[PDB]
Design a protein around this motif. Sequence first.
Motif, PDB file in Angstrom:
ATOM      1  N   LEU A   1      -4.350  -6.993 -16.657  1.00 20.63           N
ATOM      2  CA  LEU A   1      -3.204  -7.382 -17.170  1.00 20.63           C
ATOM      3  C   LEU A   1      -1.932  -7.557 -16.538  1.00 20.63           C
ATOM      4  O   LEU A   1      -0.988  -8.469 -16.751  1.00 20.63           O
ATOM      5  CB  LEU A   1      -2.978  -6.248 -18.272  1.00 20.63           C
ATOM      6  CG  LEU A   1      -4.413  -5.879 -19.140  1.00 20.63           C
ATOM      7  CD1 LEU A   1      -3.991  -4.911 -20.372  1.00 20.63           C
ATOM      8  CD2 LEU A   1      -4.736  -7.252 -19.977  1.00 20.63           C
ATOM      9  N   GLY A   2      -1.781  -6.709 -15.374  1.00 21.44           N
ATOM     10  CA  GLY A   2      -0.801  -6.706 -14.558  1.00 21.44           C
ATOM     11  C   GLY A   2       0.149  -5.594 -14.258  1.00 21.44           C
ATOM     12  O   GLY A   2       1.263  -5.414 -14.084  1.00 21.44           O
ATOM     13  N   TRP A   3      -0.626  -4.349 -14.501  1.00 20.88           N
ATOM     14  CA  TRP A   3       0.088  -3.183 -14.473  1.00 20.88           C
ATOM     15  C   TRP A   3      -0.041  -2.577 -13.177  1.00 20.88           C
ATOM     16  O   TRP A   3      -0.550  -3.187 -12.131  1.00 20.88           O
ATOM     17  CB  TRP A   3      -0.470  -1.946 -15.419  1.00 20.88           C
ATOM     18  CG  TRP A   3      -0.610  -2.380 -16.851  1.00 20.88           C
ATOM     19  CD1 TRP A   3      -1.767  -2.274 -17.645  1.00 20.88           C
ATOM     20  CD2 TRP A   3      -0.053  -3.453 -17.821  1.00 20.88           C
ATOM     21  NE1 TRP A   3      -1.800  -2.847 -18.838  1.00 20.88           N
ATOM     22  CE2 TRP A   3      -0.732  -3.472 -18.889  1.00 20.88           C
ATOM     23  CE3 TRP A   3       1.142  -3.993 -17.484  1.00 20.88           C
ATOM     24  CZ2 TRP A   3       0.136  -4.164 -19.820  1.00 20.88           C
ATOM     25  CZ3 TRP A   3       1.636  -4.645 -18.594  1.00 20.88           C
ATOM     26  CH2 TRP A   3       0.971  -4.942 -19.825  1.00 20.88           C
ATOM     27  N   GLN A   4       0.675  -1.440 -12.766  1.00 20.35           N
ATOM     28  CA  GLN A   4       0.704  -1.078 -11.532  1.00 20.35           C
ATOM     29  C   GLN A   4       0.637   0.705 -11.599  1.00 20.35           C
ATOM     30  O   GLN A   4       0.874   1.137 -12.519  1.00 20.35           O
ATOM     31  CB  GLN A   4       2.153  -1.187 -10.671  1.00 20.35           C
ATOM     32  CG  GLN A   4       2.082  -1.102  -9.224  1.00 20.35           C
ATOM     33  CD  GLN A   4       3.283  -1.818  -8.734  1.00 20.35           C
ATOM     34  OE1 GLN A   4       4.149  -2.416  -9.123  1.00 20.35           O
ATOM     35  NE2 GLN A   4       2.824  -2.232  -7.139  1.00 20.35           N
TER      36      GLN A   4
ATOM     37  N   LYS B   1       6.717  -1.376 -18.502  1.00 17.06           N
ATOM     38  CA  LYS B   1       7.190  -1.195 -17.067  1.00 17.06           C
ATOM     39  C   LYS B   1       5.995  -0.993 -16.074  1.00 17.06           C
ATOM     40  O   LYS B   1       6.283  -0.975 -14.855  1.00 17.06           O
ATOM     41  CB  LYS B   1       7.997   0.265 -17.060  1.00 17.06           C
ATOM     42  CG  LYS B   1       9.002   0.428 -15.699  1.00 17.06           C
ATOM     43  CD  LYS B   1       8.608   1.611 -14.779  1.00 17.06           C
ATOM     44  CE  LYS B   1       9.396   1.513 -13.677  1.00 17.06           C
ATOM     45  NZ  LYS B   1       9.144   2.381 -12.731  1.00 17.06           N
ATOM     46  N   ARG B   2       4.875  -1.265 -16.504  1.00 21.50           N
ATOM     47  CA  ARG B   2       3.616  -1.527 -15.448  1.00 21.50           C
ATOM     48  C   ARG B   2       3.366  -0.221 -14.761  1.00 21.50           C
ATOM     49  O   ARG B   2       3.586  -0.047 -13.594  1.00 21.50           O
ATOM     50  CB  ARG B   2       3.575  -2.784 -14.605  1.00 21.50           C
ATOM     51  CG  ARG B   2       4.247  -3.885 -15.500  1.00 21.50           C
ATOM     52  CD  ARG B   2       4.625  -4.923 -14.479  1.00 21.50           C
ATOM     53  NE  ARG B   2       5.377  -6.141 -15.067  1.00 21.50           N
ATOM     54  CZ  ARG B   2       4.845  -6.943 -15.906  1.00 21.50           C
ATOM     55  NH1 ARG B   2       3.866  -7.131 -16.058  1.00 21.50           N
ATOM     56  NH2 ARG B   2       5.813  -7.800 -16.461  1.00 21.50           N
ATOM     57  N   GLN B   3       3.121   0.875 -15.425  1.00 21.76           N
ATOM     58  CA  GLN B   3       2.827   2.120 -14.734  1.00 21.76           C
ATOM     59  C   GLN B   3       1.928   3.016 -15.684  1.00 21.76           C
ATOM     60  O   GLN B   3       2.490   3.208 -16.947  1.00 21.76           O
ATOM     61  CB  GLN B   3       4.223   2.844 -14.354  1.00 21.76           C
TER      62      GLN B   3
ATOM     63  N   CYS C   1      -3.535   6.753 -15.714  1.00 23.52           N
ATOM     64  CA  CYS C   1      -4.827   6.356 -15.707  1.00 23.52           C
ATOM     65  C   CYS C   1      -5.140   5.488 -14.793  1.00 23.52           C
ATOM     66  O   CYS C   1      -6.424   5.273 -14.494  1.00 23.52           O
ATOM     67  CB  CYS C   1      -5.266   6.403 -16.932  1.00 23.52           C
ATOM     68  SG  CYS C   1      -4.539   5.200 -18.038  1.00 23.52           S
ATOM     69  N   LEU C   2      -4.179   4.701 -14.410  1.00 33.23           N
ATOM     70  CA  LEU C   2      -4.420   3.478 -13.597  1.00 33.23           C
ATOM     71  C   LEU C   2      -4.595   3.578 -12.256  1.00 33.23           C
ATOM     72  O   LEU C   2      -4.851   2.578 -11.497  1.00 33.23           O
ATOM     73  CB  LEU C   2      -3.427   2.238 -13.939  1.00 33.23           C
ATOM     74  CG  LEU C   2      -3.571   0.827 -13.663  1.00 33.23           C
ATOM     75  CD1 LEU C   2      -4.173   0.352 -14.817  1.00 33.23           C
ATOM     76  CD2 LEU C   2      -2.407   0.017 -13.166  1.00 33.23           C
ATOM     77  N   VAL C   3      -4.034   4.775 -11.611  1.00 34.79           N
ATOM     78  CA  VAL C   3      -4.216   5.223 -10.281  1.00 34.79           C
ATOM     79  C   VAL C   3      -5.512   5.171  -9.790  1.00 34.79           C
ATOM     80  O   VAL C   3      -6.596   5.054 -10.454  1.00 34.79           O
ATOM     81  CB  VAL C   3      -3.342   6.336 -10.092  1.00 34.79           C
ATOM     82  CG1 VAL C   3      -1.959   6.565 -10.668  1.00 34.79           C
ATOM     83  CG2 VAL C   3      -4.307   7.655 -10.456  1.00 34.79           C
TER      84      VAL C   3
ATOM     85  N   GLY D   1      -2.217  -1.994  -8.102  1.00 37.51           N
ATOM     86  CA  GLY D   1      -3.114  -0.752  -8.613  1.00 37.51           C
ATOM     87  C   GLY D   1      -4.244  -0.558  -7.599  1.00 37.51           C
ATOM     88  O   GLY D   1      -4.026  -0.770  -6.588  1.00 37.51           O
ATOM     89  N   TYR D   2      -5.178   0.342  -7.893  1.00 40.16           N
ATOM     90  CA  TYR D   2      -6.385   0.308  -7.155  1.00 40.16           C
ATOM     91  C   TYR D   2      -7.085  -0.929  -7.080  1.00 40.16           C
ATOM     92  O   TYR D   2      -7.284  -0.920  -5.664  1.00 40.16           O
ATOM     93  CB  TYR D   2      -7.179   1.486  -7.678  1.00 40.16           C
ATOM     94  CG  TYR D   2      -8.372   1.863  -7.113  1.00 40.16           C
ATOM     95  CD1 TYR D   2      -8.210   2.095  -5.587  1.00 40.16           C
ATOM     96  CD2 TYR D   2      -9.466   2.739  -7.725  1.00 40.16           C
ATOM     97  CE1 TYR D   2      -9.253   2.681  -4.885  1.00 40.16           C
ATOM     98  CE2 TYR D   2     -10.534   3.169  -6.716  1.00 40.16           C
ATOM     99  CZ  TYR D   2     -10.494   2.954  -5.537  1.00 40.16           C
ATOM    100  OH  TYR D   2     -11.675   3.577  -4.717  1.00 40.16           O
ATOM    101  N   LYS D   3      -7.171  -1.876  -7.901  1.00 40.91           N
ATOM    102  CA  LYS D   3      -7.926  -2.998  -7.626  1.00 40.91           C
ATOM    103  C   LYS D   3      -9.226  -2.762  -7.200  1.00 40.91           C
ATOM    104  O   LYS D   3      -9.452  -3.213  -6.026  1.00 40.91           O
ATOM    105  CB  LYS D   3      -7.060  -3.867  -6.838  1.00 40.91           C
ATOM    106  CG  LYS D   3      -7.787  -5.336  -6.814  1.00 40.91           C
ATOM    107  CD  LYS D   3      -8.277  -5.714  -7.952  1.00 40.91           C
ATOM    108  CE  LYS D   3      -7.104  -6.258  -9.124  1.00 40.91           C
ATOM    109  NZ  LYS D   3      -7.838  -6.340 -10.152  1.00 40.91           N
ATOM    110  N   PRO D   4     -10.351  -2.241  -7.848  1.00 45.93           N
ATOM    111  CA  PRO D   4     -11.573  -2.342  -7.598  1.00 45.93           C
ATOM    112  C   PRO D   4     -12.450  -3.884  -7.949  1.00 45.93           C
ATOM    113  O   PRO D   4     -13.521  -3.670  -7.588  1.00 45.93           O
ATOM    114  CB  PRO D   4     -12.162  -1.197  -8.355  1.00 45.93           C
ATOM    115  CG  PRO D   4     -11.140  -0.600  -9.156  1.00 45.93           C
ATOM    116  CD  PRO D   4      -9.948  -1.398  -9.206  1.00 45.93           C
ATOM    117  N   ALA D   5     -11.562  -4.685  -7.960  1.00 45.97           N
ATOM    118  CA  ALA D   5     -12.082  -5.940  -8.230  1.00 45.97           C
ATOM    119  C   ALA D   5     -12.714  -6.204  -9.699  1.00 45.97           C
ATOM    120  O   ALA D   5     -13.643  -5.280 -10.057  1.00 45.97           O
ATOM    121  CB  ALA D   5     -12.895  -6.723  -7.103  1.00 45.97           C
TER     122      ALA D   5
END
Length: 184
Positions: free
Chosen positions: A23-26, A35-37, A40-42, A98-102
């Motif tokens: 979606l575009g979070w961080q 604010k994209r934070q 749980c996204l870490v 983010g982590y980006k596991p693809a």
Amino acid sequence: LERIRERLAENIHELWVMNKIELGWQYGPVRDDNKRQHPCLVEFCKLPEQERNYNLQMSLETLKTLLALGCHVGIADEHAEEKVKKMKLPKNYQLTSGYKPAPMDLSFIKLTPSQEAMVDKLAENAHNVWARDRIRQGWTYGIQQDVKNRRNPRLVPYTLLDDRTKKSNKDSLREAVRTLLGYG
């Protein structure tokens, strides 16, 4: 039998996060949507303990529910993660923070309306506990106090709030069951 299914639960948590990473979070210690934070996204190694045990509880409840229903699609067959990973993660990649596991990529399995009914029953349980939270606290609706206008369209957890409104949950459950069928 728990460990092999624990790997699949971790893979399902990864499915959820890379469904919301794209979606575009961080990664961030404070939970904000615009604010994209999200904590749980870490990355997996730095996940909060509260959300991790919530994920474990939802996992074990889903295994108990699907064993009661009789839709055993794992444990007996080989699992698809880490050492026996089905290369779903490296198949497709996205450029977001983010982590980006693809992101996920699974075209080797299809869906059956039996698992669609199991998705419906999982939604039954989820909206049951959701309506319990709404009614016990009096949140999102009110007859005497009217805490906010536009009361919860559900009331009955599934009759009035159909899948057309809860499309996020419907698609999440559909992707979850597709990935579970692809796991083994």
